[PDB]
Amino acid sequence: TVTFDITNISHKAIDIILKVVLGIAEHEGTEVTFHSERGQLQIEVKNLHEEDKRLIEQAIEAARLADSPDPESVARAVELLTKVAKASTNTELIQFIVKELLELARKLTDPKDLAKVLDSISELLTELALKTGDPTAALAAMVAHIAELVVRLALMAERTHPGSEIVKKAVKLVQEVAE
Amino acid sequence: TVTFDITNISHKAIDIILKVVLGIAEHEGTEVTFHSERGQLQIEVKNLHEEDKRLIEQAIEAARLADSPDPESVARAVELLTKVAKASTNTELIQFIVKELLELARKLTDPKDLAKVLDSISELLTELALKTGDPTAALAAMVAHIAELVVRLALMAERTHPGSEIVKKAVKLVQEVAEEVLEAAQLMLEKPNSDEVAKKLEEVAKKAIEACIELQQILEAWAKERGDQDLLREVREHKLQILTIAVAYKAAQMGVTVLKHTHGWVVFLVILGLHKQQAEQLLRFVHRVAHALGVTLSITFSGDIVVIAVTVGASEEEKKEVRKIVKEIAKQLRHAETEEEAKEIVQRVIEEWQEEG
Amino acid sequence: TVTFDITNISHKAIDIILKVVLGIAEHEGTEVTFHSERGQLQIEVKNLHEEDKRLIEQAIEAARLADSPDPESVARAVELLTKVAKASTNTELIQFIVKELLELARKLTDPKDLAKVLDSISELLTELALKTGDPTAALAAMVAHIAELVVRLALMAERTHPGSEIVKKAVKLVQEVAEEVLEAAQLMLEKPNSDEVAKKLEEVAKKAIEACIELQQILEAWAKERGDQDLLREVREHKLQILTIAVAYKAAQMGVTVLKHTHGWVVFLVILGLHKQQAEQLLRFVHRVAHALGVTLSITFSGDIVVIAVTVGASEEEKKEVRKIVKEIAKQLRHAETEEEAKEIVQRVIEEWQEEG
Amino acid sequence: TVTFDITNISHKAIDIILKVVLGIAEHEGTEVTFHSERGQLQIEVKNLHEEDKRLIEQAIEAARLADSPDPESVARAVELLTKVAKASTNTELIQFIVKELLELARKLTDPKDLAKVLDSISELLTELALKTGDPTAALAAMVAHIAELVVRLALMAERTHPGSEIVKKAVKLVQEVAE
């Protein structure tokens, strides 16, 4: 048997947790036991594989970050949850945490963070063009590549000026592209 | 002949009578002789049976009341009309009466009297739901008894502190519960087995449980102000029961069987024979309805069987005992072939849990 | 008015028509008048409709034939009497019609003459689902497609030589399968949705499949004596069809849905949503019919879904291809949700298998 | 994956195979894949555990011995099948083995084989006491030990007596007791 746990994680975020752990338990003859305290949650699991123990762990870190005020924690949250997206094999977990990704996308303001979000969106799209099955989705690979070139340019939005109205315009039109 | 008299009933009530009396009389081709004026009426019917005559007389006692202003007469009226609704053979003849109950509900503006509307609604839906064969026969009771908690709670709240003005919240809440359910019953009559009837008889619960919950918290406030350990024990248990109802209401929409128990500070449940995605479809509801209340709980599952239990105010070792129980229940259910075995198995755990002392 | 002039009916037919006419009057209160002088009869009625008249007319056309010994007249009788059973609604009238099919059916000595007797039974079993709400009743009609197949299964022999000792065995078998099914129909009408009829249905079902199975091997012997590759194609397909239908019988009793497909040298099934503790019954029954026929088959059992496929036999490459397709069917199903997704994705892999040709 | 073959099957034996080779994964839904073709049968499985591989192995010996005419192979078949009963987890399965153990019991004759059956049914009853929890199954084991004493004694009788109708009668009375 394997055991795992959290404290303080917000009632906003825990629906993502809940969706992951049950979702994994349905596979490969695995089973779970589970306790809740309106401020604490605990997981116990039958014969979990360590790569899935990482998946659950990684989701738990992202859930710790998800409801935080800190932009770097938001940026990191998108990164880690995007690792959860490309790790996740079921369609609905993606269908859900991308919705959260969009709710996170409007938070950001800072070039490298937004750039890593666009880069994470490149991971999402590069999975999604394959996860949609049939080859007519290949357009999204070009969109993702355009996002890459956007972020390669976005380095200049940090480097070239001390936060002028021109680089603010650049960030905001880029944020529109992200949304 | 039988020969009624319908003296002094008003225009709308004659419209009820002439429909129900023909709608009953026609089945055996019977002779009828109405006579009518400004403000008076009388009837004969040839060869109408005693057990049929009492349906007409009950419709007449409703008709002789249905234009009263008095809330208590309205309370009797909804009961009488409910009896007529149970006894009636044709569902459109039920539609033709149950629509008037919407006026009774919207007219009524005291919670202690709304008691009877929120009561009678249960029976009103119950007979139609059982006769049409949908799982809606529970969902009517599930909402109605959850609403009756609000009636009970309102009564004891006002009895705890006279002039409890906040009850105006409850009045509007339970009124909208009544309006929503009565119209959902109208849709269920019009569109039996339909996906829109499934969507409405799903939706009612969402507003219902929220409406239940607030008055539980308001009694929890009055109980905190009074401090009586007996009243505290009563209100906390009046919390616990709400979850015990709603879990059925959601399981029922899947066709899933549920079994439940209650002892002191603990609620126990099993939700049998559950496939794939549905454990989220269950828990994503069966979490929040708990998290709303300040409850503490234990959850476990093993392929197509799920086991849950709930408590308030227990020690860590009592909670551990609940964990022991549910984990044991899950393991001991796994090999069982039928729900008749499950019933014995959970009963065995609960009897042995008491026998260890 | 409506009038009619029935002649030469015996007391039996008089009792039938007397039940039918007052059985029609019961909804309407119509002034019947019979008249009678033994050997001859008349009726008048008022206020009957043209479709009612056609129910009476077809009832009396059965009645003025049901005296007669000729198998062709029996073939008409058994065609007509089920129409009376479709059209009417009083359960005892259905029984008092259906009880005559029983004493008609036993008469017939020749397989092509009992053709319609078996069809009529298959029609009645189709009616039992409508009359009782249990799909296991029409499921017995899926078994009763064998009762149609029986005509083919004799006919192939008769179109080369008539009346062999094996054809004589066939009529006794299929008569017995008729007799027990018409009894099981009788018990279903007398006490619908019950464990005694469920048992005596199964008790003939296990014989019905055997009766088909024995007929295949005489077709097979006849076909290998003929040596024609097209007749050999006909018998392999008529073999494969048995399992294809009969497997549904235990599947839909267990409450699981079924899906199936055919491509001339292969047959596919998937059966879905099994609660695990009972699946070995479906499998054990799938094994019996399989080994009885001498087919090759492939199975995969994964979570709550089971895939089966069957063949006359092919190269080891075609065999391992079929095994691959079966595994892909399981793999692509196991984390889908709906019966619709099954319909789609099974069709899709069959299409993806065929479009590379 | 794990995999096994059965060849030169007896069609009469197959259900004793069938109910365990399905049955082991039935607790959790682990994939079993299965092919059969009129006297040949093959099974393949995901992550099957060591003692469960031995459960299958023992069964697929037993179903090859189950209708062999050689008496020592029948004694072995009792030993194996009774080890299948020792390995039992389910409650219905054992019924299907015991009805075969009856069909074996009445075709035994010789003292060593008799000892294997008496001893192994004593085991079956001791296992059945652990499965049922009732002291009357402990009584049944005591009666099987009374028989065991008769069998430890019969193994003296078969080499002290010169062979006679008296010792034939005795072993036949003992066999009747065993049934």
User: Which of D28, D29, D90 is closest, CB to CB, to B335?
Assistant: D90
Q: Which residues of chain B lie closer than 8 angstroms to C275, CB-CB?
A: 273, 304
Nearest CA in chain C to D34: C299
The answer to whether C26 faces chain B, any CB pair under 8 Å, is: no
The subunits that touch chain B, with at least 3 C-beta pairs less than 8 Å apart, are A, C, D
Question: Which B residues in the span 319-338 are in contact with D, Cβ-Cβ below 8 Å?
Answer: 334-335, 337
Per-residue tokens: A85 = 């997206």
Measured CA to CA, the distance from residue A79 to residue A85 in angstroms comes to: 10
- DSSP lists the bridge partners of residue B310 as B267, B297
Given an 8 Å threshold on Cβ–Cβ distance, is B280 in contact with A18?
A: yes
- Kindly report the nearest CA distance between residue B287 and chain A, in angstroms: 9
Q: Does D91 touch chain B (CB under 8 A)?
A: yes
Q: Which residues of D touch C323 (CB under 8 A)?
A: 35
**Angle between helix B136-160 and B167-190 (nearest 10):** 160
Return the sign of the alpha-carbon dihedral for residues B3, B4, B7, B13. Answer: negative
Q: How far apart are the first and last CA of chain D?
A: 42
Cβ atoms of residues D179 and D106 within 8 Å: yes
Q: Whole-angstrom Cα distance, residue B45 to residue A157?
A: 93
The answer to whether C245 touches C145, Cβ cutoff 8 Å, is yes
**What whole-number distance in Å separates Cα of residue B35 and Cα of residue B3?**
11
Angle between the B71-87 and B91-107 helix axes, to the nearest 10 degrees? 170
Optimal mutation site among A31, A41, A88, interface B, most CBs of chain B within 10 A: A31
Among chain B residues, CA nearest to A35: B298
The one-letter code for the residue type at D106 is R
Q: What b/e readout covers C243-263, taking b as 16+ CB neighbours within 10 angstroms?
A: bbbbbbbbbbbbebeeebeee
Q: Give D71 to chain A, closest Cα distance, Å.
A: 42
Count CA atoms closer than 13 A to C265's CA, side-chain side: 6
Any CB–CB contact under 8 A between B18 and chain A? no
Token output for B338: 């039928």
Cβ distance D30 to A31 less than 8 Å, yes or no, reads no
- Say how far apart CA B26 and CA B22 lie, in whole Å: 6
D28 and B335: CB-CB below 8 Å? no
Q: Which residues contact B294 (CB under 8 A, 6 or more apart)?
A: A38, B239, B312
Q: Which of C283, C290, C302 sits opposite D29 (nearest CB)?
A: C302
Name chain D contacts of B303, Cβ cutoff 8 Å: 27-29
> Nearest residue of B to residue A34 by CA position?
B299
CA–CA gap between residue B342 and residue B334 (Å, rounded): 9
Q: How far apart are CA C162 and CA C159, in angstroms?
A: 7
Give the angle D94-D98-D103 at the CA atoms, nearest 5°.
150
- Select from C28, C275, C337 the Cβ nearest to the Cβ of B273: C275
Cα B16 to chain centroid, rounded: 27
CB atoms inside a 10 Å sphere around CB A79: 18
How remote is the C-alpha of B213 from its chain's centroid? Answer: 16
Resolution in angstroms, to 1 decimal, for this deposition?
4.3
Structure tokens at B297: 């709980």
Q: Which of B251, B290, B247, B244 is nearest to B267 (CA)?
A: B244
Structure tokens at A171: 């960030």
Taking CA atoms, what residue in C is nearest to D42? C298
Helix ranges restricted to H, chain C? 11-25, 50-63, 71-87, 91-105, 115-132, 135-158, 165-190, 195-226, 229-253, 279-293, 316-333, 339-354
Q: Are strands C296-302 and C305-311 parallel, antiparallel or unpaired?
A: antiparallel
The CA distance from C327 to C299, in Å, is 9
**Residues of D with Cβ-Cβ distance to A27 under 8 angstroms:** none
Query: Which CA distances in Å does C245 have to C139, C240, C249?
Result: 9, 9, 8
Burial string for D101-134 (b: 16+ CB within 10 Å, else e) reads beebbeebeebebbbbbbbbbbbbbbbbbeeeee
Question: What number of CA atoms fall less than 13 Å from residue B298's CA on the CB side?
Answer: 22
Q: What angle do CA D128, D133, D139 make, to 5 degrees?
A: 65
Measured between beta carbons, which residues in chain C are less than 8 angstroms from residue B28?
29
Angle, alpha carbons A166-A170-A174 (nearest 5°): 170
Size of interface B-C (CB pairs under 8 A): 18
Of B29, B275, B335, which is closest to C29 when you measure between CB atoms?
B29
Instruction: List, in sequence order, every beta strand (DSSP E) within A37-106.
Output: 40-45
Quick one: how far is CA B333 from the chain centroid? 31
Residue type, B331: K
Handedness of CA C116, C121, C125, C128 (dihedral sign): positive
Contacts of B338 (CB under 8 A, 6+ apart): none
Residue A134 has what DSSP assignment?
Answer: S
Cβ of residue C296 closer than 8 Å to a chain D Cβ: yes
How far away is chain A from the Cα of D97, in angstroms, using its nearest Cα? 27
Say if the Cβ atoms of B275 and C29 lie within 8 Å: no
Q: How far B241 CA lies from chain C's nearest CA (Å)? A: 31
DSSP-assigned beta bridge partners for residue C3 = C44
Question: Helix, strand, or coil here: A34?
Answer: strand
Residue (of C20, C17, C22) closest to C32 by Cα position: C22
CA-closest candidate to residue B292, choices B203, B177, B214: B214
Q: Are C306 and C281 in contact (CB under 8 A)?
A: no
Interchain contact, A31 vs D28, CB within 8 Å? yes
Buried b vs exposed e over D141-156: b needs ≥16 C-beta within 10 Å?
Answer: beebbebbebbeebee
Q: What is the 3-state secondary structure (H, E, C) of chain B?
A: CECCECCCCCHHHHHHHHHHHHHHHHHHCCCECCEECCCCEECCECCCCHHHHHHHHHHHHHHCCCCCCCHHHHHHHHHHHHHHHHHCCCHHHHHHHHHHHHHHHHHCCCHHHHHHHHHHHHHHHHHHHHHHCCCHHHHHHHHHHHHHHHHHHHHHHHHHCCCCCCHHHHHHHHHHHHHHHHHHHHHHHHCCCCHHHHHHHHHHHHHHHHHHHHHHHHHHHHHHHHCCHHHHHHHHHHHHHHHHHHHHHHHHHCCCCEEEEEECCEEEEEECCCCCCHHHHHHHHHCHHHHCCCCEEEEEECCCCEEEEEECCCCHHHHHHHHHHHHHHHHHHCCCCCHHHHHHHHHHHHHHHHHCC
Q: How far apart are CA B295 and CA A109, in angstroms?
A: 40
Lay out the sheet containing C40-45: strands in order across.
Answer: C2-4, C40-45, C33-37
β-partners of residue B301 are A32, B306
Biggest distance spanned by C-alpha atoms of chain C:
80
Yes or no: say if D121 and D75 are a contact pair by the CB < 8 Å rule: no
Residues of D in contact with B334 (CB under 8 A): 27
Which site among B288, B297, B308, B311 would you substitute to test the A interface, given the most A Cβ atoms closer than 10 Å to its Cβ?
A: B297
User: Which residues on C lie below 8 Å from B275 (Cβ)?
Assistant: 273, 304
Q: Do B294 and A32 touch (CB under 8 A)?
A: no
Q: Give the span between the Cα atoms of A151 and A178, in whole angstroms.
A: 11
Q: Which of C29, C275, C337 sits opposite B276 (nearest CB)?
A: C337
**Maximum Cα–Cα distance for chain B, whole Å?**
78
Q: Find where tokens 């689902």 sit.
A: C129
**CA dist., res. B340 & res. B272, Å (int):** 12
Query: In sequence order, what are the beta bridge partners of B32?
Result: B45
Is residue B276 less than 8 Å (CB to CB) from chain D? no
Q: Which helix (H) or strand (E) segment is D15 a member of?
A: helix D14-23
- Residue C319 in tokens: 């065999």
Nearest-angstrom CA–CA distance, B221 and C308: 62
Please indicate if any CB of chain B lies within 8 Å of the CB of C278. Answer: yes
Q: Are C113 and C100 in contact (CB under 8 A)?
A: no
> Cα A131–A134–A136 angle (5° rounding)?
110
Q: How many CB atoms lie within 10 A of CB C20?
A: 23
B335: which chain D residues are within 8 Å (Cβ-Cβ)?
89-91
Interface test with B, best of C132, C256, C274, C275 (most B CBs within 10 A): C275
Separation in Å, CA A165 to CA A110, A161, A170, A178, B224: 14, 9, 9, 20, 57
Of C127, C119, C64, whose CA–CA distance to C94 is shortest?
C127
- Within 8 A by CB and 6+ apart from C310, the residues are C240, C243, C244, C266, C267, C269, C290, C295, C296, C297, C298
Q: Name which of B301, B305, B311, B324 to mutate to probe chain A: the one with the most chain A Cβ atoms within 10 A of its Cβ.
A: B301
Amino acid at A168: K
* Sign of the alpha-carbon torsion through A114, A119, A122, A127: negative
DSSP code per residue over A138-176: GHHHHHHHHHHHHHHHHHHHHHSSSS-HHHHHHHHHHHH
Does A31 reach chain D within 8 Å, measured CB to CB?
yes
Handedness of CA B8, B9, B15, B18 (dihedral sign): negative
What residues of chain B lie within 8 A of the CB of C304, using their CB?
Answer: 275-276, 304
Strand (E) or helix (H) holding A76: helix A71-87
Q: Shortest CB distance from C287 goes to which of D18, D26, D33?
A: D18
Q: For B36-62, what is the HEC assignment?
A: ECCCCEECCECCCCHHHHHHHHHHHHH
The span from the CA of D119 to the CA of A138, in Å, is 71
The Cα–Cα gap between B258 and B252 comes to 8
Instruction: Please report, as a single letter, which amino acid is at residue B25.
Output: A
Distances (CA, A) of D82 to A129, B160, D68, D75, D101: 56, 71, 17, 11, 8
Q: Is C196:C188 a contact under the CB 8 Å cutoff?
A: no
CA–CA distances in Å: residue C184 to residues B340, C137, C146, C191, C192: 29, 10, 16, 11, 11
Nearest to C218 by CA among C290, C286, C141, C161: C161
Q: Please state, in angstroms and rounded to a whole number, the distance separating the CA atoms of residues D105 and A179.
A: 78
CB atoms within 10 A of CB B56: 22
Q: Which of A40, A30, A42, A51 is nearest to A3 (CA)?
A: A42
Nearest CA in chain A to B298: A35
Contact of D138 with D177, CB cutoff 8 Å: no
Task: Name residues whose C-beta falls within 8 Å of residue D89's C-beta, 6 or more positions apart in sequence.
Answer: B335, D23, D27
Cα distances from B224 to residues B210, B232, B251, in angstroms, run: 21, 8, 34
Which chains would you list as touching C if contact means 3+ CB atom pairs under 8 Å? B, D
Record: contact D18-C294, CB cut-off 8 A: no
Are A34 and B299 an interchain contact pair (Cβ–Cβ within 8 Å)? yes
Closest Cα to residue C126, out of C151, C144, C114? C144
DSSP annotation of C10 reads -
